[PDB]
Design a protein around this ligand. Structure first.
Ligand SMILES: *[C@@H]1O[C@H](CO)[C@@H](O[C@@H]2O[C@H](CO)[C@@H](O[C@@H]3O[C@H](CO[C@H]4O[C@H](CO)[C@@H](O)[C@H](O)[C@@H]4O)[C@@H](O)[C@H](O[C@H]4O[C@H](CO)[C@@H](O)[C@H](O)[C@@H]4O)[C@@H]3O)[C@H](O)[C@H]2NC(C)=O)[C@H](O)[C@H]1NC(C)=O
Ligand SMILES: *[C@@H]1O[C@H](CO)[C@@H](O[C@@H]2O[C@H](CO)[C@@H](O[C@@H]3O[C@H](CO)[C@@H](O)[C@H](O)[C@@H]3O)[C@H](O)[C@H]2NC(C)=O)[C@H](O)[C@H]1NC(C)=O
Ligand SMILES: *[C@@H]1O[C@H](CO)[C@@H](O[C@@H]2O[C@H](CO)[C@@H](O)[C@H](O)[C@H]2NC(C)=O)[C@H](O)[C@H]1NC(C)=O
Ligand SMILES: *[C@@H]1O[C@H](CO)[C@@H](O[C@@H]2O[C@H](CO)[C@@H](O)[C@H](O)[C@H]2NC(C)=O)[C@H](O)[C@H]1NC(C)=O
Ligand SMILES: *[C@@H]1O[C@H](CO)[C@@H](O)[C@H](O)[C@H]1NC(C)=O
Ligand SMILES: *[C@@H]1O[C@H](CO)[C@@H](O)[C@H](O)[C@H]1NC(C)=O
Lengths: 248, 254, 218, 146
């Protein structure tokens, strides 16, 4: 007739799933809010997942809340057919959240195992006349002077590779974006030769890929590992739930 | 029949819940500080649109749970359940009444005057008296430079304003070289001028030549009508099911 | 003769008379309607300010050679007029198209053909070796008057001249605390929201109480 | 008959195309200098000449290096001086320098290098999917009998 010692296990286990499901619902919405404006940066290369993980997960997290509240109810009520409907709702949310975990992680390394997969976009689209050239140059010229950096390898990407910039900008005048110079509060350059020749202090010398990588990495693990953490609690609760369904 | 009554009740409750979620979503949309706008509003403790929205998040979750509570109660036909339900919703009703009114009270002050004060006072300052005065004098200056340098407007009415009033910028910078912000000339892609003498004179289309009030007001104006009227509609939906539910409750045999 | 200088045309100079500066039209055709163009020529601008003794403003010496007066020795143009700028005589047919000044190539030379600017050079009072015609920032709240004069460079006499301008006023400042940051107005929505959402609670209370009473009855 | 210095302290002097050179010593100042540059593979010398500037000590920024360009990418160039002050003369021995090559943005082969995070997640979760599916199947199998 099923021990109270196992009833309590389903109660605590559902309560833990409930809370971590609500927290995952909150976190995954916080990914989709795009705290760093990287939704433009993915979409030029396409086949996206880092946000698709979150857009799967928001509903999966709220799913975990609702089936788990019901699950606490079913455990106290000890009704055979209610425990069946605990299994046969949870295990679908489970499969969707697996996809959220896998999708969110898999794209991460497909683009931030090395910076060059992102660098290709900057060399193509920076200040470039085509439609997405303007769109993504709004992302970049904001990142640049919001955070003081000239590129992923600072004032050298712009000579380490071919980019749209060369073809409009003969390098003898600017070997790097003019927005790489530090600008006064009047927005004027601090010295001309001091940026056209470039001492290491008037230039924004930092590597921009830190912000881009740390954004992508942080959004990812929030989906991916919190997902696995819910799921690793769901297995033992769902296994105990098999034993409940087969004892009652 | 009574059954029909129950049906009506449950349907209104369902609507209450879906409003809780859609309110939660709307709140998150504005609480996002979406193009910032913290910097123009933390400048005056002009934050009740956001404060209302935060209130909107937790009442939004609260209303969802209370709704299902209600259905559960109605169905279960339990006096105490209904009672508690009543109490809780009453509380939540108060908090969203508060959010509604606080957003609604705030927005009338968003004006071509208010944003012209903060711009004349707090831009390019370099002599603030105190730390949180310097912390406000940064964020205002940054926000005016985002709007002027990418969204191509200048001043609140226009490139008039800097040339008719005293300002923080003005005491730092003499007009003969800085007749209004350098952020207001049209620069070419080298991020230096089309021609500066023509931007000094105001020859039309060498400079950002429109006010920004529309950019500043437009989002704030949506946030305003947004939370407040949606809360009011919920506070009506809840009011008539509260009366009905109460009625039913009262008609419970002991 | 109404040989009067002018504030530069307000069609395309939207901010012109700033707190310390004014742009003026140049003397286009002005000295040359009776065909004066017969050799090299230059023009001086003098600036002056209203005061009772200023009717002694003899912009030339008695022997017809111009005053060598400057912003220092005139105290900003009070104790006499001062030689605020110079340029060469434009031969009238050049007629800058104010419409076409959007050709970024030509823009600066069109402005340099069309006008002169007074107030421009904040530095020039300081440097002890800038032995040039200093065009300093003009003082706020001052009505100025302006006068172009023609000089016959081959013999060194003023040839003839304009009349002083009608008074040109700088921009002048409201102190920024004067901007009443109240609206006076009320929206529409505030008043409905405050009045209805204040009303609603009372009714709920009433109803609740009534519920109580009903349940106590039965 | 000096040796050129190397201003690699304040800046980055190597580049695609243009490079930076130290001015001649203050012994020479007001003198007439010719810089000479030579692409290593060839006899191909190029002359550019200027007066030796007044010694502004260490006051920062002007062309205070000389700048040299049309130094086409990947090329090793030697750099050298001949200078004069009166009928007296001055010199230095060559020094070699090398300019970066060009690289294609479309020649970015995807540097795709998987972390163990991905692969640990995939294995762990595919195992968990398997275990739950199997479990669910076996649970309902047993319950079918009761
Ligand atoms: C606003 O007010 C400022 C400051 O009051 C004025 O700026 C100064 O203008 C004077 C004009 O006389 C500049 O004078 C210098 O004169 C030198 C003359 O030296 C010999 O060499 C020249 C050839 O160059 C011979 O023809 C001459 O006979 C002498 O034998 C020039 O050599 C100087 O040129 C150098 O300095 C300038 C300024 O840095 C550079 O642009 C040149 O490329 C060159 O390096 C110069 O002409 C004086 O230097 C200016 N000072 C400043 C601070 O700018 C403005 O004229 C005034 N503007 C307006 C519109 O009112
Ligand atoms: C430094 O002083 C020397 C010596 O005057 C300058 O070098 C060269 O001097 C010769 C003779 O005075 C000049 O020769 C003539 O050159 C023309 C071309 O400019 C050529 O067609 C004639 O056949 C004749 O050879 C020459 O102009 C001059 N310049 C060069 C580059 O040869 C030198 O220019 C001075 N450098 C500086 C920095 O002033
Ligand atoms: C990308 O840029 C870096 C510098 O940001 C280049 O680094 C070179 O490194 C070697 C060895 O340390 C030095 O001899 C060179 O002087 C460096 N270059 C410069 C400009 O100083 C690096 O070569 C570039 N890589 C690619 C693949 O282009
Ligand atoms: C400036 O005025 C003088 C004086 O009238 C003009 O020069 C004289 O012209 C007469 C008549 O042709 C000649 O007899 C004299 O020899 C001239 N003087 C000299 C010193 O040559 C002069 O033409 C006028 N110049 C301008 C630019 O108007
Ligand atoms: C800077 O702003 C403060 C108020 O925020 C004001 O008191 C001060 O006068 C301003 N600075 C200048 C230079 O006027
Ligand atoms: C050049 O540098 C070397 C090595 O430091 C030094 O021995 C020599 O005296 C210097 N001068 C000359 C003329 O070679």
């Amino acid at each position: 007739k099923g021990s109270p010692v196992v009833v309590g296990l389903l109660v605590v286990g559902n309560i833990i799933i409930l809370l971590s499901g609500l927290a995952l619902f909150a976190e995954t919405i916080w990914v989709t809010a795009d705290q760093y404006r990287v939704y433009p940066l993915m979409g030029v290369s396409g086949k996206d997942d880092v946000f698709a993980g979150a857009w799967i997960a928001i509903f999966c997290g709220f799913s975990f809340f609702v089936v788990a509240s019901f699950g606490v109810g079913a455990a106290l009520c000890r009704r055979r057919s209610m425990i069946l409907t605990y299994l046969v709702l949870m295990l679908i949310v489970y499969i969707f959240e697996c996809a959220s975990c896998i999708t969110s992680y898999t794209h991460r390394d497909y683009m931030v195992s090395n910076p060059s997969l992102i660098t290709k976009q900057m060399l193509t689209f920076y200040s470039a006349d085509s439609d997405q050239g303007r769109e993504l140059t709004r992302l970049w010229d904001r990142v640049m002077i919001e955070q003081e950096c000239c590129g992923t390898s600072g004032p050298m990407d712009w000579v380490n590779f071919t980019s749209a910039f060369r073809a409009s900008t003969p390098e003898v005048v600017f070997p790097w974006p003019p927005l790489c110079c530090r600008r006064t509060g009047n927005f004027i350059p601090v010295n001309e030769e001091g940026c056209r020749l470039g001492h290491l202090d008037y230039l924004f010398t930092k590597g921009c890929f830190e912000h881009i990588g740390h954004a992508i990495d942080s959004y990812t693990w929030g989906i991916s590992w919190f997902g696995f953490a819910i799921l690793m609690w769901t297995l033992p609760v769902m296994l105990i739930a098999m034993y409940f369904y087969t004892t009652l | 029949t009574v059954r029909c009554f129950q049906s009506l009740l449950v349907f209104g409750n369902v609507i209450i819940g879906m409003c809780g979620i859609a309110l939660t979503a709307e709140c998150i949309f504005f609480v996002s500080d979406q193009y910032s706008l913290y910097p123009l509003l933390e400048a005056t403790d002009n934050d009740d649109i956001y404060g209302a929205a935060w209130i909107g998040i937790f009442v939004g979750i609260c209303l969802f749970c209370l709704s299902v509570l209600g259905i559960v109660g109605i169905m279960k036909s339990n006096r105490k359940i209904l009672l508690v339900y009543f109490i809780l919703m009453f509380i939540v009703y108060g908090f969203e009444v508060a959010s509604c009114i606080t957003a609604a009270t705030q927005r009338d002050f968003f004006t071509p005057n208010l944003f012209l004060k903060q711009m004349l006072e707090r831009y390019q300052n370099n002599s603030p008296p105190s730390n949180d005065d310097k912390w406000k004098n940064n964020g205002v200056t940054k926000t005016w430079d985002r709007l002027m340098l990418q969204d191509y407007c200048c001043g609140v009415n226009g490139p008039s304003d800097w040339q008719k009033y005293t300002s923080a910028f003005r005491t730092e910078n003499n007009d003969a070289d800085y007749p209004w912000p350098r952020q207001c000339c049209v620069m070419n892609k080298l991020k230096e001028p089309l021609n500066l003498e023509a931007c000094k004179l105001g020859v039309p289309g060498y400079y950002h030549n429109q006010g920004c009030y529309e950019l500043i007001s437009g989002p704030m104006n949506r946030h305003a009508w947004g939370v407040a009227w949606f809360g009011f509609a919920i506070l009506c939906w809840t009011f008539w099911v509260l009366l009905g539910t109460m009625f039913y409750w009262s008609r419970i045999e002991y | 003769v109404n040989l009067q200088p002018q504030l530069a045309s307000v069609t395309f100079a939207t901010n012109n008379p700033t707190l310390t500066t004014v742009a003026l039209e140049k003397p286009l055709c002005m000295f040359d309607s009776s065909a004066a163009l017969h050799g090299t020529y230059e023009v001086y601008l003098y600036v002056l300010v209203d005061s009772a003794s200023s009717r002694n403003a003899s912009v030339q010496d008695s022997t017809k050679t111009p005053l060598s007066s400057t912003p220092q020795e005139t105290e900003g143009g009070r104790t006499g007029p001062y030689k605020a700028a110079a340029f060469d005589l434009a031969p009238c047919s050049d007629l800058p198209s104010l419409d076409a000044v959007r050709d970024v190539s030509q823009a600066s030379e069109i402005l340099n053909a069309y006008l002169v600017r007074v107030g421009i050079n904040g530095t020039c009072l300081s440097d002890p070796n800038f032995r040039g015609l200093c065009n300093p920032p003009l003082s706020a709240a001052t009505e100025y008057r302006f006068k172009y004069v023609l000089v016959n460079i081959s013999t060194g006499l003023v040839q003839d001249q304009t009349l002083w301008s009608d008074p040109v006023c700088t921009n002048q400042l409201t102190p920024y605390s004067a901007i009443d940051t109240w609206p006076g107005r009320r929206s529409g929505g505030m008043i409905v929201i405050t009045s209805i959402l204040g009303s609603l609670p009372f009714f709920l209370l009433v109803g609740f109480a009534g519920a109580i009473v009903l349940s106590l009855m039965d | 008959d000096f040796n050129i210095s190397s201003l690699s302290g304040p800046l980055s002097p190597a580049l695609t195309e243009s490079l930076l050179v130290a001015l001649p010593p203050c012994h020479l100042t007001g003198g007439n200098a010719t810089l000479m540059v030579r692409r290593a593979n060839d006899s191909k010398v190029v002359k550019s000449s200027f007066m030796v500037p007044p010694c502004r000590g260490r006051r920062e920024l002007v062309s205070s290096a000389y700048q040299v360009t049309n130094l086409v990418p990947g090329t090793k160039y030697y750099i050298s001086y001949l200078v004069t002050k009166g009928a007296s003369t001055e010199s230095s021995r060559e020094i070699p320098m090398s300019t970066l090559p060009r690289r294609k943005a479309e020649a970015i082969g995807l540097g795709m290098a998987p972390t163990g995070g991905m692969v640990v997640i995939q294995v762990l979760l595919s195992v968990a999917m398997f275990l739950l599916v199997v479990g669910f199947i076996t649970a309902l199998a047993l319950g079918a009998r009761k």
